[PDB]
Amino acid sequence: NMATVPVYCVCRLPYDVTRFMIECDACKDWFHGSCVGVEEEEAPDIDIYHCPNCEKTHGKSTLKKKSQLFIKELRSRTFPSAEDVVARVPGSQLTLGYMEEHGFTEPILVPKKDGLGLAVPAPTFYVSDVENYVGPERSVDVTDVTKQKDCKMKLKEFVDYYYSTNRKRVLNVTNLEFSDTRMSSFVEPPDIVKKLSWVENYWPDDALLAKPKVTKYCLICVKDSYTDFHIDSGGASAWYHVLKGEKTFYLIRPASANISLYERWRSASNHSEMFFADQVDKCYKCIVKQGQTLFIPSGWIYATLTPVDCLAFAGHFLHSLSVEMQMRAYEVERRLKLGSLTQFPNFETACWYMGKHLLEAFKGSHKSGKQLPPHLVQGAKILNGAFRSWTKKQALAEHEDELPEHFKPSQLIKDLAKEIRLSEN
């Protein structure tokens, strides 16, 4: 049952993970080191490499170039397995009805992509292909794992680091939204995510403000890298799919004590020198392998450990099953006032659109003679209270920018309050 795959080098063979290869700078093709007489030891001495076919016209090769203990402190601990809390659900059985029955309060791991409606490239898709479709000149946010700092650089400069032997630095790319690139057509979020997303359902097509550019993330994590504990912006639930390699997740339940500890920990200037898992009771260790998809609920504090080179796709979304938790995380995020790099764009704008939808649902409930489910009523009250805080005379200037066009908050707040009171009998 054959299929078609790319081939490389003069021998025109598929990629071999056990064979050292070097890419010609002219034809952009990879050649086996043994095939072209290049040994892996002598590879760093080369500046520009040209294969013999390219050397005929483009000239000869320029063969003249002129936190580890912290990772050991992660497996030093004996964390409980995720099987106690993380459920294993087939993609076909992870439907909208399943979410309503269980409430999406614990992470869900789907071992097989089948049934999820997830569209991802074939496993023969490499970081070299990521550069071509995202754009080699596109600027990306690269995280220095050892220094725990961020810096901007060209994508071609990072991929040069990725495809270099004996990496001196530990650099990761975890904030790369490619929905505006050619690679966006290759990735489609799981169908359950699109069903549950507030933006996918309630964001108007003619809205002047742009939709939250959080739908398609690409992650390139190098071997023996680490990402610290964090909460996704706005309490957005997330989905992670590992195309190649594997990832280890360290999940902490968003309990009231744990959320408070995270806020105080993240606010501290020396939060990178403090291991956050010390202060929490239970920190579940979950291993997401190749081809597996992990769904993280709202407000969960998670960190990742990468034992091998890993290419993964992720996305953030908001749903109606964790309205209270999403607001609480957003309030914590606002108080922290951290860097607006991994933030959730137009989080309040989505809430205003959600509030408008809830008011229409309340009108529909009156017409149809069937009141809304209790969680929608509670979420409406939570959102309605936030609307008053955002549009208060002493706080409107902060939240006016995210207010949608042709929106009169005073009418919306008054209508929601009356509908909630009417639907509370």
Partner: peptide, 7 residues
């Protein structure tokens, strides 16, 4: 020169 190591 971009390279791919062995395993």
């Amino acid at each position: 020169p971009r390279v791919k190591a062995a395993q």
